[PDB]
Amino acid sequence: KIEEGKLVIWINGDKGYNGLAEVGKKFEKDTGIKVTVEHPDKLEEKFPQVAATGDGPDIIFWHHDHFGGYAQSGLLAEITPDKAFQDKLYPFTWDAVRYNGKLIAYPIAVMALSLIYNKDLLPNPPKTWEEIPALDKELKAKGKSALMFNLQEPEFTWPLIAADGGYAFKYENGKYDIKDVGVDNAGAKAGLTFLVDLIKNKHMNADTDYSIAEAAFNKGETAMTINGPWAWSNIDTSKVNYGVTVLPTFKGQPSKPFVGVLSAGINAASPNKELAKEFLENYLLTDEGLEAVNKDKPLGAVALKSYEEELAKDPRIAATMENAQKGEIMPNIPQMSAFEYAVRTAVINAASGRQTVDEALKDAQTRITK
Secondary structure, eight states: OOOTTSEEEEOOTTSOHHHHHHHHHHHHHHHOOOEEEEOOTTHHHHHHHHHHTTOSOSEEEEEGGGHHHHHHTTOBOOOOOOHHHHTTBOHHHHGGGEETTEEOOEEEEEEOOEEEEETTTOSSOOSBSTTHHHHHHHHHTTTOEEEOOOOSSHHHHHHHHHHTTOBSSEEETTEEETTOOBSSSHHHHHHHHHHHHHHHTTSSOTTOOHHHHHHHHHTTSEEEEEEOGGGHHHHHHHTOOEEEEOOOEETTEEOOOEEEEEEEEEBTTOTTHHHHHHHIIIIISSHHHHHHHHHHSOOOEESBHHHHHHHTTSHHHHHHHHHHHTSEEOOOSTTHHHHHHHHHHHHHHHHHSSSOHHHHHHHHHHHHHO
8 A cells, every 4th residue: 555644756767856856845844744756667667567556656757648548447546626727737738638538637748849940051941841842952952951850650740641630539528539530531641642742752761760860950961850859959969050940831731740748647546645636736836846847857848837938938948839739639548559550651651652642541540440
């Protein structure tokens, strides 16, 4: 069993744990309650094992894409933030922490791909995908390419595919319809066709992966790339004069990247559910709380409006949130793994020529709906 009278928190060591501990001292100072933070290896794997025997931490911090499986095994307690507290965070973040209609976690930070460009090569990045082909011809006359990004993982191409209508699973009334998949509709085919055309016209090469794109970009060979916050440090050291901005639109509609939400859940077996709620709502999810974490280590875009507005003075963090607000929340249901294999394959086959956009997406849809 979990000891009553105190709080034990688990969070990955790459996050600001000393910060959370700092909020913990504040909490103890205030209430006299002890708060201890631990960061075990493979904690996201350990949690379901120890929580299943009625043990583990009171609170667990991790990307929401793992909370669906946790809730599915009843490993998380239903949280009870009232309407006023909920209105303190961007509305879209709450959709990432709902399990079959029930809120099962507090969103903390938001992640999503943005458009990264070389300010020297491109003082004014393109507002649309449509204008990239001609921009590439212009730049190639100077021995540079317009854009390069990972074409081997679905996360990087989906923003364009979803712009005109593609989606993973229909989400309405707080829930997903596992039977409504939009992988082979006109919107998706339009986006993939445009991606394929770029390749066909030699603006991009179907073989470009993550390593190749970063190399080209950090080396000043290509004017733009698509990647998340986790890639910035590597660019900082390349000394490239880079900027981060909203993704290009397609057919007048915003690209829609998948959004990841760092969340804090309460162990279903925790006898300290009330202390956890007090800690999370009134200590961590405040400007002072988040300020303590961020300082120890960067949080990036946060879900708390008031503090997000402060961090947003950094155009890169503001861009992450803009792209996230226009993005598609990453579904946490089990079928999402089928979508990721099916779509990775379709994109690679359409890109290589092994399949037409029509056939590749037709087979993916069928695969995901089975």
